[PDB]
Amino acid sequence: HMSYTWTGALITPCAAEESKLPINALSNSLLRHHNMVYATTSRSAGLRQKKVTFDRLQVLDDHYRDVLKEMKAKASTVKAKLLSVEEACKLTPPHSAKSKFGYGAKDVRNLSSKAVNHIHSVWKDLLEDTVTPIDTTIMAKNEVFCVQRKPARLIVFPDLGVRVCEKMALYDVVSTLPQVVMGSSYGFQYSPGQRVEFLVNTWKSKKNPMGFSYDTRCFDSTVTENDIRVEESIYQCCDLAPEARQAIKSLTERLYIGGPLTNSKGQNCGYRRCRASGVLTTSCGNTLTCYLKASAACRAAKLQDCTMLVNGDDLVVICESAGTQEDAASLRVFTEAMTRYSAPPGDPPQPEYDLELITSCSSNVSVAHDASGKRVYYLTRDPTTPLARAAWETARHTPVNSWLGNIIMYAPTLWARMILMTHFFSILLAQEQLEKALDCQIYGACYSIEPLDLPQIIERLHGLSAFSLHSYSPGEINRVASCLRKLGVPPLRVWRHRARSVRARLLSQGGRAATCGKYLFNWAVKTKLKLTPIPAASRLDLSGWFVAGYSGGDIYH
Numbered sequence: 160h161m162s163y164t165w166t167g168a169l170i171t172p173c174a175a176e177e178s179k180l181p182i183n184a185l186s187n188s189l190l191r192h193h194n195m196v197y198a199t200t201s202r203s204a205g206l207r208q209k210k211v212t213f214d215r216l217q218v219l220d221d222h223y224r225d226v227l228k229e230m231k232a233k234a235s236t237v238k239a240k241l242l243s244v245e246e247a248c249k250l251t252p253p254h255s256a257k258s259k260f261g262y263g264a265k266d267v268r269n270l271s272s273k274a275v276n277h278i279h280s281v282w283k284d285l286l287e288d289t290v291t292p293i294d295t296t297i298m299a300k301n302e303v304f305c306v307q308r309k310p311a312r313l314i315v316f317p318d319l320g321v322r323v324c325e326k327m328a329l330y331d332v333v334s335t336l337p338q339v340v341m342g343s344s345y346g347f348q349y350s351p352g353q354r355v356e357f358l359v360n361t362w363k364s365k366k367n368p369m370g371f372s373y374d375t376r377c378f379d380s381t382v383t384e385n386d387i388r389v390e391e392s393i394y395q396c397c398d399l400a401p402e403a404r405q406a407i408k409s410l411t412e413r414l415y416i417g418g419p420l421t422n423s424k425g426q427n428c429g430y431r432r433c434r435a436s437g438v439l440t441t442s443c444g445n446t447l448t449c450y451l452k453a454s455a456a457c458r459a460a461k462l463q464d465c466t467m468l469v470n471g472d473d474l475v476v477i478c479e480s481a482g483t484q485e486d487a488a489s490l491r492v493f494t495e496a497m498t499r500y501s502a503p504p505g506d507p508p509q510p511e512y513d514l515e516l517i518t519s520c521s522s523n524v525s526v527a528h529d530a531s532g533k534r535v536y537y538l539t540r541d542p543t544t545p546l547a548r549a550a551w552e553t554a555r556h557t558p559v560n561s562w563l564g565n566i567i568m569y570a571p572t573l574w575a576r577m578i579l580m581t582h583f584f585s586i587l588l589a590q591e592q593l594e595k596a597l598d599c600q601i602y603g604a605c606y607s608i609e610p611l612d613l614p615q616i617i618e619r620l621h622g623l624s625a626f627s628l629h630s631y632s633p634g635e636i637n638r639v640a641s642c643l644r645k646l647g648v649p650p651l652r653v654w655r656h657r658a659r660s661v662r663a664r665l666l667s668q669g670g671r672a673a674t675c676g677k678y679l680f681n682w683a684v685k686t687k688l689k690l691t692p693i694p695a696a697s698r699l700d701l702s703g704w705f706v707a708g709y710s711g712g713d714i715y716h
């Protein structure tokens with residue numbers, strides 16, 4: 160019952176890999192301690208292969224089968240449509256990994272006959288064959304972090320032709336099923352503003368609230384064949400077209416359960432008997448499995464008035480406290496149950512009695528004040544990884560702009576407003592690239608966004624208060640300041656000075672640029688401009704944004 164077996168062949172790159180932070184003329188204005196920033200490469204993949212390779216033991220009790228039966232009853236109310244080739248092709252990112260069969264993502268997006276023909280033959284083969292393991296590529300991801308070094312994460316993905324077929328059979332399932340099965344517990348249905356509201360409302364609804372986050376050590380590797388067959392049995396409860404049922408059963412037996420791993424050089428690296436990180440069902444499967452195991456663990460631990468918030472492999476639980484002794488013992492029993500279900504933790508969970516102390520999705524709730532002095536709750540995170548990635552993106556073009564996603568998702572934060580908006584609007588002004596649409600990810604899905612649309616997007620996700628927050632918490636300020644000293648980032652006063660320049664430059668330009676200057680940099684000036692709602696905010700087609708998670712799912716919206 161090993162998560163992986165290996166041949167000894169190495170995980171190889173597809174191009175030249177840089178691990179050291181690239182430096183240009185704009186680097187120093189953002190970050191001085193360059194040596195602190197690094198990118199993971201395939202050369203550390205051997206260290207990751209060791210960490211993810213282990214035996215899985217699974218003991219399934221009555222709480223587990225009880226929760227499963229309820230999940231299946233809710234799943235039986237779902238009706239899912241089969242997507243056409245064209246529809247599935249349009250969901251493919253432009254920079255998605257090319258096929259081994261002579262076509263790429265642009266060919267798929269342009270509906271080229273060679274791509275469309277191969278997709279049809281892959282589909283027919285899924286319907287005809289339910290036993291042949293589907294080949295996957297194993298690659299090391301190149302992700303940027305600040306030191307204290309993490310080994311590269313591994314991405315396991317089938318061919319582009321299989322990926323388009325997964326969309327046809329399961330895109331509607333993975334987009335509609337989680338919210339039906341989990342209701343309000345499904346976290347990917349919420350914008351950051353709706354998630355804040357949900358958590359504060361849940362925390363308030365308890366007499367003596369207690370909360371914790373459960374961090375499973377390498378979740379993908381803890382996912383067993385049993386778990387993947389349980390997920391398929393959940394998908395099979397839906398009202399599906401007969402071709403979709405057969406494709407789902409085939410994709411499960413041939414791909415989802417496991418299969419051979421091939422490097423970029425076409426060599427066999429070994430065999431996967433756990434979750435693939437680069438399939439359409441990664442996010443949905445992980446969400447369901449985590450919800451199933453955590454809900455059964457909640458029953459085994461006898462947690463009182465339990466409220467969960469699950470999204471992918473990330474889990475937040477809020478419940479009624481029984482005092483620090485009984486809470487510690489309840490969390491030990493919850494951990495023991497999760498361990499038996501093959502989901503042991505990285506760090507053992509800790510009970511928290513202050514909402515602001517619970518960390519999940521690397522985020523925590525914090526408080527600031529609006530223009531009328533009223534308390535406003537927002538989601539924040541340690542700005543180290545966002546700032547390290549922004550330093551990389553200042554000197555190199557990347558297929559996903561993490562700074563853009565970070566401004567969108569963390570717009571109310573002190574660091575996104577003063578540093579990220581200031582730095583990147585300065586770069587866009589100098590290059591006259593304000594109107595150029597940039598790629599970013601929201602819950603694993605890829606989006607092409609125009610920076611000039613940022614004030615309307617932020618209003619819709621966070622409200623106008625996002626442009627007026629002040630009097631941030633001492634804890635938040637100290638965490639931001641501590642990060643700036645560590646990375647060698649200029650103090651917040653320098654950023655204020657730079658923002659007055661960025662704002663004036665945006666205003667001088669009029670139109671949409673002036674709107675950016677007005678709303679995004681109102682914090683920079685003492686004499687504040689009046690921020691009324693934006694007409695274009697209501698015109699925004701923000702559908703598909705907070706519907707589901709698609710991490711590793713190769714989705715473009």
Ligand SMILES: COc1c(C(C)(C)C)cc(-c2ccc[nH]c2=O)c2ncc(N3CC[C@H](CNS(C)(=O)=O)C3)cc12
Binds near residue numbers: 470
């Ligand atoms: C819901 O919380 C999140 C927020 C909040 C709302 C806190 C701000 C913001 C982002 C996010 C941040 C920045 C850019 N884009 C984003 O999507 C975000 N991104 C991913 C995410 N995941 C939860 C676990 C998923 C990975 N596990 S897996 C492989 O099993 O699917 C990824 C949660 C997120």
